[PDB]
Structures are given as C-alpha cells and as structure tokens.
Design a protein around this ligand. Structure first.
Ligand code: QZ3
Ligand code: NA
Length: 186
C-alpha cells in the first residue's frame, strides 16, 4: 500500500509519518518511508531549493519551471518507490505529487479543477509514470508568505474534497494514529 502525507510546512508531517509507522508496525505491518523533495540526492531538487533562495536567475519566477524540477526529482525515485511497494506492506511518502498540485495552483491563484493541477497529473502520473497513491492524507493545522501558505492549505483541502489522484483523508494535529492506521488498512 502506498500512502502520501501532505500539508503545508510546519504542519508536523514528519511527526505524523512516524506516528503512523509505529501504528502500522503495532498492527503487524512492515513500513518503509521516503521524504520529498530529495534535497542532497536530486540535482533537480537542489536547483529548485536554490532557485527559491534567489539563485539561478529568473528560474523561480516560473511556477511551471519549479513544478517541473520537483517532478523530475520524484520521477528519479520511481524505481525506488516501486521497489519499496514490493518489499513492504506500507510505503509512506512525506510529500508526493499533490504537493506539486497544491503549491503550483496556490501560486497561480487557481483551484484544484484548474490547469496547473491537471498538468501535474498529466506530467507526473501519466507521462513520468509515477504510481498513484492508494491514500493521500492531508494534515490540516491552524498555524504551521503567510497568505500563500494559507491559500496552499486551502487548495490542499480542495484536492482532498475532489479526490484528486485518488482517495484522501483530512486529519488534525491530534489524530489518533492507531485509528488512522485501521482506516487506511486494506
Ligand atoms: C513554485 C511552486 C512550487 C511547487 C512545488 N512543487 C512540489 O512538488 C514541491 C514539493 N515537494 C514543492 C515544495 C517543496 C518543499 C517544501 N517544503 S520544505 C521540504 O520544508 O522545504 C514545500 C513545497 C513546491 C513548491 C514549494 N513550490
Ligand atoms: Na491565475
């Protein structure tokens, strides 16, 4: 089973990934995890992070440019992801493809039915062949540009409400991991 944990920065995603891992293992299930972006391993990731800090000219001015780099990062790990899905009962990703839909849409003042979010699907799932997650779990918290961060949180909620790329659950900071693991299990 492939699960992606999503949300804005400071939502506490990694804490949830770890809480979920423990719960799945307590339930008898093997777990492996990966985090995106793969800063330090992916040149595309690194150039993207670097662009957001003003390097690489006018690169960061293009939403689709940044989205492409982050996509290329994930596409590089496609064989790793498919390997974990064979080796383990549950693979949890700290960020996945929906990060690209939410952050790009938000920046472009588009909604989840908009062009960018659709493009992301065409590019990452169809073209680049990234597997669709069985579940995407949005961690939605009150407080993690802040208007952009809150707009991203909202668009996330909209991907969840529309079942973008598959089934979602939306959860809070205090969700019970044992109960969440039971809901996610096949
Ligand atoms: C310009 C539009 C745009 C598109 C994006 N697409 C992605 O796929 C993606 C991812 N993953 C991110 C991203 C990367 C790191 C983050 N947070 S972090 C690890 O704590 O630095 C938060 C978001 C992303 C961003 C920031 N912006
Ligand atoms: Na727009």
């Amino acid at each position: 089973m492939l699960i992606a944990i999503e949300g804005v920065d400071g939502a506490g995603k990694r804490t949830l990934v770890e809480k979920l891992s423990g719960a799945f293992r307590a339930a008898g299930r093997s777990v492996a995890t990966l985090a995106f972006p793969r800063y330090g391993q992916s040149v595309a990731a690194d150039i993207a992070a670097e662009a957001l800090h003003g390097e690489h000219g006018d690169l960061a001015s293009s939403v689709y440019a940044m989205a492409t780099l982050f996509a290329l990062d994930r596409a590089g790990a496609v064989h790793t992801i498919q390997g974990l899905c064979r080796g383990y009962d549950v693979v949890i990703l700290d960020r996945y493809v929906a990060s690209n839909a939410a952050y790009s849409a938000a920046r472009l003042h588009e909604n989840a039915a908009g062009k960018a979010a659709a493009w992301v699907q065409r590019i990452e799932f169809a073209r680049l062949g990234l597997p669709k997650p069985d579940w995407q779990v949005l961690l939605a918290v009150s407080a993690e540009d802040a208007e952009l961060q809150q707009r991203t949180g909202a668009v996330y909620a909209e991907l969840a409400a529309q079942g973008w790329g598959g089934r979602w659950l939306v959860v809070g900071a205090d969700v019970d991991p044992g109960r969440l693991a039971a809901t996610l299990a096949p």
